[PDB]
Structure 1
């Protein structure tokens, strides 16, 4: 868990700005491993984040190498070279629809795993999906994640910043976060991905988003998004928590649609 700072080499220029994300190298038992390092500018939050990542083991979740306490506290992770999904899609506007389905399906597999593991992500957004390659996505950013109690299917937040545009109505109304509220966020993530990394609910305040949803209104179908994928976004945006599907049902819908698109392409 606790890494050796002399086996860590950090790059001077940051990748992005709880502080900063930098590229580095970690000397392993034989090979050198390229890493992404979250550097704090908060300590207990970083340790809790690390504690969540250490418990997860799935191909569609970012692997934590360890933590290091040096000049600042550091969370060292396996590098996903292509960076955040929203930025990548904004920069690569010609990624095919089949490829977007492939990536969102991978996110749904990682989330099916998280749901099975009884962890709630609480910040599932396209900025929190990282690309290993153009065909391999991993979920990142476990800073708000919670391990659910053995006796409850939700985490109750004590005092409300929150990414409100990705939050289900029960998060807003009752401060209750479950794998079903992660499904709602996944619906917004799908909308972002099929919109090539555009921000959801453009030009609206959080209170205006809440008023829109309460009226039963939902974002429109993005340009070129298949009807089946839009129907799935709408199903993730089921107001009633009990009627909303879980990740097992969402992943199955995506898996079947993806292989329909794969075999039709052949």
Structure 2
């Protein structure tokens, strides 16, 4: 849970920077082999957000979710995680526009498998976006960023946000905007936007639109168009994820099964 600074070796090259801080490559010396790791180095309120994130990550074990190695207190607070070398899905596809639909279907399916586990475990992610899916290889994706994530109470099936902070509104379902209600079916809406992103090769969704204009668009029943080259069955699945009414919107068991069948039917040719 708490790592040993002596055994942690960081490299001076920053992989990515932001408001959260920087991410760096490092090596953690285990029992025999050393393991390459990604280290989130936070630059009072900041400490509790990473501890809470760490406590969430510790509870989750799945091939399609980035694992936490532990936390370390040095000059800065550090969250040590499995390294996803190829980095964010959106930036990867922006720089590799020859990746084929069969490969994108595979990647989003792997995300549907990770979210299904999360749904089974009664965790809501609350920040599912192409920028938060990381590539271990071109054929292996992992969900990351659990800083907004909540373990649901054993008697409730949603989480009610009190504070309206800086929200990525374009990934958020209608009930998140109007009632601040976050459930696994809200993540399903975000997964729909993640699919559009994946098949649009890292294009921003609702481009040139403010968050209020998007809400108005969804309220008129309008939905983003089919990306160039995206198969019809995946776009139908996007639209199903963008079901306004939360009761008629599917959970990730249905979403993942839908993705599983179509992928195997696309393969074999």
TM-score by length of 1: 0.99
Q: Distance in 2 between matches of 1:159 and 1:121?
A: 17
Q: Distance in 1 between matches of 2:77 and 2:31?
A: 23
Q: Distance in 2 between matches of 1:57 and 1:75?
A: 17
Q: Which residues of structure 2 form unaligned runs of 5+? A: none
Q: CA deviation at 1:222?
A: 0.3
Question: For each residue in 1:187-234, what CA deviation from the matched residue of structure 2 results, as whole angstroms up to 9, or x when unmatched?
Answer: 000000000011000000000011100111000000000000000000
Q: CA deviation at 1:84?
A: 0.4
| 3-state SS, counterpart of residue 267 of structure 2 | helix
Question: For each residue in 1:107-155, what CA deviation from the matched residue of structure 2 results, as whole angstroms up to 9, or x when unmatched?
Answer: 0000000000000000000000000000000000000000000010000
| 3-state SS, counterpart of residue 90 of structure 2 | helix
| 3-state SS, counterpart of residue 64 of structure 2 | coil
Q: Following superposition of structure 1 onto structure 2, how do residues 22-171 of structure 1 map, counting pairs within 5 Å?
A: 22-41=24-43, 42-160=46-164, 161-171=166-176
Q: Which residues of structure 1 form unaligned runs of 5+? A: none
Q: Distance in 1 between matches of 2:77 and 2:135?
A: 25
Question: For each residue in 1:38-85, what CA deviation from the matched residue of structure 2 results, as whole angstroms up to 9, or x when unmatched?
Answer: 110111000001100000000000010000011100000010111000
Q: CA deviation at 1:13?
A: 1.6
Instruction: Give the ranges of 4+ consecutive aligned residues of structure 1 lying more than 2 Å apart after TM superposition.
Output: none
Q: Distance in 2 between matches of 1:165 and 1:213?
A: 10
Q: Distance in 2 between matches of 1:10 and 1:218?
A: 45
Q: CA deviation at 1:88?
A: 0.3
Q: CA deviation at 1:25?
A: 0.4
Aligned length: 264
Alignment root-mean-square deviation, CA: 0.5
Q: CA deviation at 1:159?
A: 1.7
Q: CA deviation at 1:165?
A: 0.3
